[PDB]
Amino acid sequence: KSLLQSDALYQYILETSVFPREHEAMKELREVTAKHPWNIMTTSADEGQFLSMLLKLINAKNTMEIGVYTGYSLLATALAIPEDGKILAMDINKENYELGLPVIKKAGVDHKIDFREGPALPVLDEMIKDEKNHGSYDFIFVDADKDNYLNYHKRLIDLVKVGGVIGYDNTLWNGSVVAPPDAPLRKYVRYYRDFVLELNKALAVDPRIEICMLPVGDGITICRRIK
Amino acid sequence: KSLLQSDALYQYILETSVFPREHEAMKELREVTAKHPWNIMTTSADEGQFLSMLLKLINAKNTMEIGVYTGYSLLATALAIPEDGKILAMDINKENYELGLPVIKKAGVDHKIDFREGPALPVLDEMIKDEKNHGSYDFIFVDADKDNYLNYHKRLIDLVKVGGVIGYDNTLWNGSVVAPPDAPLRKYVRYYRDFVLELNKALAVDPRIEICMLPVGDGITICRRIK
């Protein structure tokens, strides 16, 4: 499903504004992923289209992605940034990443990707220690844990430059953020729900960023660093 | 009512992301606009936060607005852009602008507007004649009539520069594609749905832009100029 009022409205957007003129490598990868068990996690085409737009608009060149899976956001990112662009991508799996890596290579853009297998926090902590890494990123996309978002934000805010933009994905969490106390949901969404609400409250109050909650995909909260 | 899954969800977005960080008087003007005698068309609380983000992200300085009325989106733009730059508040026909100018004046940011009254089409045509008004606007937001959109685009595509970004409101027109010819929809909406459906199809195919249909309010299509 989606966050709009009708699956038809959503589709109308896809059929008229996304699928036509959408590279193909995306189409390919989106096809490969459909065969995989956890494909429910791949990000939507409409949202990859928005990310493309945004990347272009802010003319980003150096970026980071936490939560790669298969590679949809990644591919989208690499096809948008300039030829000399660079992306630091982190995921705990890796086998899932290689499942899509063939398509990224087939789009001749895999060279902008530095994949690192393993938990993201450890890495973040080591980067903080080097003052050279501070304010060194144009864009940072966060589509991983959830119970770890606030933790990431603590070091991410010093890694993104003032120019800004950190994207926290899934902030509307399937709407569960307003589900009536009596409408049983999947155990995982019920679990991650407390963290999202908490995450959102913190972001709304954080003086170092500007923020915009866009109901595209499962919701992206765009944060622009102001200090 | 919004275009999202539920009113609650839409409220959540405003409750957590807008009202709190919301600008000064955005609620003033918003309360004012609610006093307007006709109060016919819609005024979304989630647009200001969005244009603000968009505008600062592209570092807009020289912009233009076509279709004011109270000036809500106009205020937002004025507040979001630098005290430096100016806004060619192109025009509108009625003086609902006058009704809100007090607030925009009170928020002291009116010194950026260059309001003009009466049809803009004539004005665009003029501007076009001088080969130097081509690619001189950083951003253009169109929330005018509807049958004039396609007519404006034909001109607007030359007034915006590289990234430029032209935005058009109500591009999803409250749920355009309803149940096939058998839906209980007012004649008023059915009349304009025709121009939207068409506007959408054209925009989706124009090779000079990239576009992106975002579900903010009643729908906003962001167009980035590439050719």
Ligand SMILES: COc1cc(/C=C/C(=O)SCCNC(=O)CCNC(=O)[C@]2(O)[C@H](OP(=O)(O)OP(=O)(O)OC[C@H]3O[C@@H](n4cnc5c(N)ncnc54)[C@H](O)[C@@H]3OP(=O)(O)O)C2(C)C)cc(OC)c1O
């Ligand atoms: C970390 O986590 C993450 C997480 C993600 C999350 C992913 C999403 O996919 S969001 C969704 C994108 N994918 C989807 O769109 C497809 C998901 N499927 C759905 O949305 C569903 O169709 C249905 O929910 P539902 O239709 O609303 O139904 P419901 O459970 O709320 O049910 C209510 C009725 O069912 C029925 N009922 C009773 N007991 C049960 C039961 N045990 N089970 C089901 N029904 C019932 C009764 O009649 C209920 O009514 P009442 O008795 O209370 O009056 C599903 C939620 C299962 C990505 C990620 O990557 C970064 C990451 O890291």
Ligand SMILES: Nc1ncnc2c1ncn2[C@@H]1O[C@H](CSCC[C@H](N)C(=O)O)[C@@H](O)[C@H]1O
């Ligand atoms: N602590 C952690 N560190 C790094 N990656 C993690 C993580 N916890 C979960 N992940 C990963 O976060 C991934 C993101 S899934 C969604 C995003 C992806 N860019 C896409 O568009 O498909 C999960 O697949 C998972 O393997």
Ligand SMILES: Nc1ncnc2c1ncn2[C@@H]1O[C@H](CSCC[C@H](N)C(=O)O)[C@@H](O)[C@H]1O
């Ligand atoms: N030629 C014209 N140019 C601009 N606006 C016009 C117009 N003719 C009529 N209008 C009136 O302009 C109104 C604008 S409603 C715009 C509201 C939106 N929240 C925003 O601030 O962006 C239309 O509903 C219409 O009745």
Ligand SMILES: [Ca+2]
């Ligand atoms: Ca996601």
Ligand SMILES: [Ca+2]
């Ligand atoms: Ca409007």
